[PDB]
Amino acid sequence: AFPDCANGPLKSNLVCNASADPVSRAKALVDALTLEELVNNTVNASPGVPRVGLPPYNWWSEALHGVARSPGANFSTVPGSPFSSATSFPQPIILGATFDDDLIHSIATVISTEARAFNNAGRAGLDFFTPNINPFKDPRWGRGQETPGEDPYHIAQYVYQLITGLQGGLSPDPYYKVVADCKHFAGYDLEDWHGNNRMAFNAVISTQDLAEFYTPSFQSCVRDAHVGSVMCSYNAVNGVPSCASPYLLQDLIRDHFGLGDGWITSDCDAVDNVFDPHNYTSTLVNASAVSLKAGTDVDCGTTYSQTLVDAVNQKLVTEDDVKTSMVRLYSSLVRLGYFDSPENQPWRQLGWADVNTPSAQALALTAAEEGVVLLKNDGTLPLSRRIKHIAVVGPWANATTQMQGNYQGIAPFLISPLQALQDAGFHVSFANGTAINSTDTSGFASALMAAKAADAIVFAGGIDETIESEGHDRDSIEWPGNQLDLIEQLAALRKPLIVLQMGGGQVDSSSLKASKAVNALLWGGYPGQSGGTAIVNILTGKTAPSGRLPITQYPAAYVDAIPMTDMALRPSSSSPGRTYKWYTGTPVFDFGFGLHYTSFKLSWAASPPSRFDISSLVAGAKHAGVAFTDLAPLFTFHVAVKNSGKVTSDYVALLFAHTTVGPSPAPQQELVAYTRVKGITPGRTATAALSVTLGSIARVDESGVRSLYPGKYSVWVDTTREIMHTFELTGKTTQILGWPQPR
Ligand SMILES: *[C@@H]1O[C@H](CO)[C@@H](O)[C@H](O)[C@H]1NC(C)=O
Ligand SMILES: *[C@@H]1O[C@H](CO)[C@@H](O)[C@H](O)[C@H]1NC(C)=O
Ligand SMILES: *[C@@H]1O[C@H](CO)[C@@H](O)[C@H](O)[C@H]1NC(C)=O
Ligand SMILES: *[C@@H]1O[C@H](CO)[C@@H](O)[C@H](O)[C@H]1NC(C)=O
Ligand SMILES: *[C@@H]1O[C@H](CO)[C@@H](O)[C@H](O)[C@H]1NC(C)=O
Ligand SMILES: *[C@@H]1O[C@H](CO)[C@@H](O)[C@H](O)[C@H]1NC(C)=O
Ligand SMILES: *[C@@H]1O[C@H](CO)[C@@H](O)[C@H](O)[C@H]1NC(C)=O
Ligand SMILES: *[C@@H]1O[C@H](CO)[C@@H](O)[C@H](O)[C@H]1NC(C)=O
C-alpha cells in the first residue's frame, strides 16, 4: 500500500506536499513521529505507523538478473496468471562475458520496468538489493556467479550502465524508477572456505589493494552512477566489521565516493554479527549503536528495532542519529514517488502487460547469445549441415532451473539445450549419463548407446548450485564427479564431440583442451531462460559466437598455491598472485579469451599518438566535460577491424595496458578500454573506438593514492596481442585522486 496524501492522516504533513523539497518532506514526516515509532521503522520489514496512515514497507527485495524471489517479492501461485513469472536474464557472469555495456543498460531498463509493474501489483518494493559488484577474485567463490567477473574496470563500466538503467538516468529527473543498491561493500568475496565463515571472517586488506582492487567498482556505482543505496558487508576489514566501520561507511562511501544522503543497509543481520560471532561489541545494544554511528541506516533484521531505544536511553546513540537515518530512508522513498499521487507517474501505470514483452524475451536471448564463450574449435562448429542425429548427454543436457543460477525468480519458460536441439529439428538421443557430482557409473552405458549411432555428440556438464552457492565455496576447481571420465569414454567413439562447460566459476578443462577427440568447447555459465536456444543458435551457426571469458580459468593446482583467506593480490612468498593482472602461473584459458566463426585483421585506423606531458593532460582534464580528473581522457584509439573471413560476426575489442613506471611491482596487464563492434560482414572493415581515461592509466601507490607517472607504456588490442603500441608519459609524477587514510 501507499500512503493516502489526498485524504489520509498525513495529507497536511509537508511529506504529502508534492512540490516541496524531498529532504524537507522526509524531515516533516520524521518530526511528526515518536522516537519509538522511528526506531520501529529502522529495519527492512518496517511496519510503518498505522497512527499516521503510514503503511508497512519491506526494504528487502531482490532483482539481480530479473525480478527475483525475496521477502518483499510475491510471485503468483497460479502458473499462467498475472505476475506468475518475470524475465530471468542470464547470471551477471555471462552478462559480463558479453562486454556489451549498452546491452547492460537495456537489461537494467527491462528489470526496472518489470519491477515497477510488480510493485504496482503489491508484489515488490521499489527497492532491490542489486547489483553485487565484489570482484570474482578467488576462483572458488560460491557467489562469484553473481558478478560480472574479476576485473574492476569491467565491473565499473557494467555497474554504471546497470545503475543508470535501473534508476532511470543519472538523477531522479521526476522520480527514481527503482532504487538500486551496490552491495557487500568492503572486501567480501568468500563464503565458508575451510571454516572461515563470512559472518566471522576478518579480511586483512592493504590500503593499496583496498583502493586498487576492492573498491573502484564502488567508485563507479556511488560517485559516477549516483546509486541511492549501498549495502555494508557481513565480514570485517582489518578487525572492524564493515557495517560498524565509520572509515568505510563515512570516509569512503559517503564522502570519498559521494553517497551523501543515500542510505546504507546492512547485510541481513550483519549488525547482529557485529556482536555474534564477530565479538566486536560485548552487547547487542552496542553493536546496533556503533553500526548506527558508523553509517548503517537500516538493519536487514530485527536487531535495530529491538535495541536502538535501549541505545538512546544508554546514551550510546542520540535520538538525532535515529532521526537522520529515518530522514535518509524516507527521502529515498519520497524521490521514488511513494508520497506522490500516482496520476502523473507513468511508472505507477505499468502492469502485467509490461513484463514478458516480446522485446524483453528477445533481450534475454541476445544476452545469452553474446555471453557464451567459444573456448575451443577445430572447424566442427558451426555444425555441418549433413549432421542430423545428435546424442545429448550430461547433467546439464536438459537443464532448466539450473540455467537460472541463484537470486532468480520464476521464469516464463526454461528452454534446455535438449529442447532447443529439438526445436532446431535435430533427431536427438538423450541420456543423463551421470550426475553433477557422483561416483556412480551406472548411466555410462546408456549414454554410450545414445552416442553409438549418432552424427555428433553434445556433452553438457560442469558445476551448478550444488557445487557453488552463497554459503558454500569450492575446495576444488576441477570438474566434479566422474563427468570427465564419461567425456573420455564418449571421445573414444571418435565422432564429432562438443562439450558444454556450464556453471559460473570455471573448471579445469585442460584435459579437454589437449584431446584431439574433443573437437569443441564452450563455456555457457548460467545462460538464463533462453539459454538452450542461444547455445544451439551458436552451435548451428544461426548466431556466431563472440563472448569472451570475464574470469580466468585457473589450473586446478591453484587451489593449493594460495589460500582463499589471502586478501593480497600481488605475488609473494606464498602466492602466485591473483587474477589476470598478477597471476604468475599459466591459465588454462586467459581472461578475455574467446573464439569466433571468422578471422579478423586489425590495424590502425588513425595513427596512434606517441608522447604526452602529464601536466598537459591534468590541465586539459578541467576542459573535458567530466566531473572528476580521473574520468578525463588520456586518448581514444581508433582500430580498424577487417572481417578477413567468410562469416558475419561481432568482435569484442579489448585494450590491455602495461607499464614499468610508478609503483613496483606493476601489473602484467590491466584492461583499460573495450568496445563491442557489431555485425562486421565478410570483407568489411569496421572501426572500433577505445577510450582510455587518466584514471585507468594512473597507478595506485602504497597509500591508495592514484597518480600519473612518467614512463614507457604499451597497449595491445586482444589477448593475443593483435596490434600493439608504445607511448611515453613525461613530466612530474602528479596526483590524480587522493585516498582517505584509515582511521
Ligand atoms: C505546499 O507548500 C507550498 C509552500 O511550501 C504551498 O504554496 C502549497 O500550496 C502547498 N501545497 C499543498 C497541496 O499543500
Ligand atoms: C512498534 O512495533 C510493534 C510491532 O508492530 C508494536 O507492537 C508497537 O506498538 C510499535 N511501537 C510504536 C511506538 O508504535
Ligand atoms: C501474495 O502474498 C500474500 C501474503 O503476503 C498471499 O496471501 C498471496 O496468496 C500471495 N499471492 C498469491 C497469488 O499467492
Ligand atoms: C570477545 O572479545 C573479548 C576481548 O575483546 C574477549 O575477552 C572475550 O573472551 C571474547 N568473547 C567471545 C565469546 O569471543
Ligand atoms: C562499544 O564498542 C566500542 C567498539 O568496540 C567500544 O569502544 C565501546 O567502549 C563500547 N561501548 C560500551 C558501552 O562498552
Ligand atoms: C527435461 O526436463 C523437464 C523438466 O523441466 C522434464 O519435464 C522433461 O521430462 C525432461 N526431459 C527428459 C527427456 O528427461
Ligand atoms: C535424468 O535425471 C534426473 C535426476 O535429476 C532423473 O530424475 C531423471 O529421471 C533422469 N532421466 C532419465 C530419462 O533417466
Ligand atoms: C562432490 O561430493 C563429494 C561427496 O559429497 C564431496 O566430497 C566433494 O567436495 C564434491 N565436489 C565438489 C566439487 O563439491
Author numbering: 1 to 743
The authors write:
Here, to gain a better understanding of fungal xylan degradation systems, which can enhance enzymatic saccharification of plant cell walls in industrial processes, we conducted a comparative study of two glycoside hydrolase family 3 (GH3) β-xylosidases (Bxls), one from the basidiomycete Phanerochaete chrysosporium (PcBxl3), and the other from the ascomycete Trichoderma reesei (TrXyl3A). The xylan main chain is degraded into xylooligosaccharides with low DPs by xylanase, and these products are further degraded into xylose by β-xylosidases (Bxls). PcBxl3 consists of three domains: (β/α)8 domain, (α/β)6-sandwich domain, and fibronectin III (FnIII)-like domain. The relationship between substrate specificity and degree of polymerization of substrates suggested that PcBxl3 preferentially degrades xylobiose (X2), while TrXyl3A degrades longer xylooligosaccharides.
To uncover the structural differences between PcBxl3 and TrXyl3A, the crystal structures of both enzymes were solved. There is a single molecule of PcBxl3 in the asymmetric unit, whereas there is a protein dimer in the case of TrXyl3A. N-Acetylglucosamine moieties were found at Asn17, Asn40, Asn74, Asn279, Asn286, Asn398, Asn432, and Asn437 of free PcBxl3. The overall structure and order of these domains are the same as those of TrXyl3A. The FnIII-like domain is connected to the active domain by a linker, as in other GH3 enzymes. The conformation of Glu470 (PcBxl3) is the same in the native and liganded structures of PcBxl3, but Glu492 (TrXyl3A) has different conformations in native and liganded TrXyl3A.
